[PDB]
DNA sequence: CGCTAGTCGAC
DNA sequence: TCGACTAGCG
């Protein structure tokens, strides 16, 4: 997503173990153990071959948050937002493509470009994740699919209070406004911890660290949302922030000309798709499991109309909603693949 | 030379 | 493929 954030705030990051959580709960955004564990059974997964290697490798890192005393909460992605629909399309094409290829390589003889080719197209299915739900479950976890990016929800949890911390590899939980995000955690529990609070011991920053601002700087920069200017990373997009104190962003980025000491003539598609973006990181839309219902991430302020945020998520009934973070109802088809009920603690 | 982003290198 | 590294842009 956004590009060279940790190491443009590394200053703000320290070295832990996560016994410091001992007695507490944190989110773990599972794509991140699902992934590296899916990476070993490549070429069994791309046979259609049954694997639980990656399962027992989510349960590594789950049975060592729950030696030290941890809560683990794991959550998984859901729905894709309608905007990145086609993205993931061309994802699951290019990862048929290198299947494909995969098997064509395998009958020539040749298994290290097999490998490597299956390697490079992992999809992460729903049935796997849903194995690590079952066998995490077994164990006592509690685990949540998240209506559709599993940052958003991760983000709610830590701004819930239900949460403490996340554990994760995407720094863009950062722009999400999350207070402490756990990065680069191994099987041990050795991570890089960065509070949000700690944002202000990096000098570069200014007075871009509070999460307005930084939000803005991030999305400035280049996210997934919207494709940053032509030259624009996360120095130039702080400059212009440090050297702008408007509260109006728009105006702010249509003078960008100005603020980098040269002319720049800002297109209204760039101007609506960063509104577009804002919104995504302020309004999509999670499942809330204490009142069991679908809100957006922030309350909603008075300059926003919710029925003009599609893009940020689209809401559905609660039950559905719920057998959906359950993990009982399939994402892309909505069957019914499980019955498991929390009411026979996550859900009070 | 500061900075962005194309490309290297591990998976 | 994807984050890190640095060639080369401005
Ligand atoms: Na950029």
Not at 5 to 12: C, R, S, V, Y
Request: aromatic content about 8%; some cysteine; glycine content about 6%.
């Amino acid at each position: 997503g956004i590009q060279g954030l940790l190491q443009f705030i590394k200053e703000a990051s320290e070295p832990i173990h996560v016994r410091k959580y001992k007695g507490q709960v944190v989110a773990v955004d599972t794509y991140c153990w699902l992934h590296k564990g899916a990476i070993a059974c490549a070429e069994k997964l791309a046979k259609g071959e049954p694997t639980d290697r990656y399962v027992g490798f989510c349960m590594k890192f789950v049975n060592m948050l729950l030696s030290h005393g941890i809560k683990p909460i794991l959550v998984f992605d859901g729905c894709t937002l309608p905007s990145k629909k086609e993205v993931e399309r061309s994802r699951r094409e290019r990862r048929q493509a290198n299947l494909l290829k995969g098997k064509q390589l395998l009958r020539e003889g040749k298994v290290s470009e097999a490998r490597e080719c299956f390697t490079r197209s992992i999809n992460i299915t729903h049935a796997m994740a849903h194995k690590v739900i079952k066998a995490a479950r077994s164990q006592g976890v509690d685990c949540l699919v998240a209506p559709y990016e599993a940052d958003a929800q991760l983000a709610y949890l830590n701004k819930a209070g239900i949460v403490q911390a996340i554990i994760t590899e995407d720094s863009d939980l950062l722009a999400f406004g999350c207070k402490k995000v756990i990065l680069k955690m191994d099987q041990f529990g050795n991570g890089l911890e960065i509070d949000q609070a700690r944002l202000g011991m990096c000098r570069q920053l200014g007075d871009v660290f509070t999460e307005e601002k930084f939000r803005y700087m991030c999305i400035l920069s280049g996210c997934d949302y919207l494709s940053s200017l032509r030259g624009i990373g996360l120095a130039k997009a702080c400059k212009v922030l440090r050297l702008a104190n408007n509260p109006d962003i728009v105006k702010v980025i249509k003078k960008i000309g100005h603020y980098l000491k040269m002319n720049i003539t800002v297109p209204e598609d760039y101007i609506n798709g960063f509104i577009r973006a804002n919104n995504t990181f302020l309004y999509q839309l999670v499942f809330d499991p204490i009142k069991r219902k679908l809100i957006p991430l922030n309350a909603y302020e008075d300059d926003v109309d919710p029925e003009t945020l599609s893009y940020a998520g689209q809401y559905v009934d609660d039950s559905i909603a719920l057998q959906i973070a359950l993990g009982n109802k399939d994402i892309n088809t909505f069957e019914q693949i499980d019955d498991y009920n929390p009411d026979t603690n996550l859900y009070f």
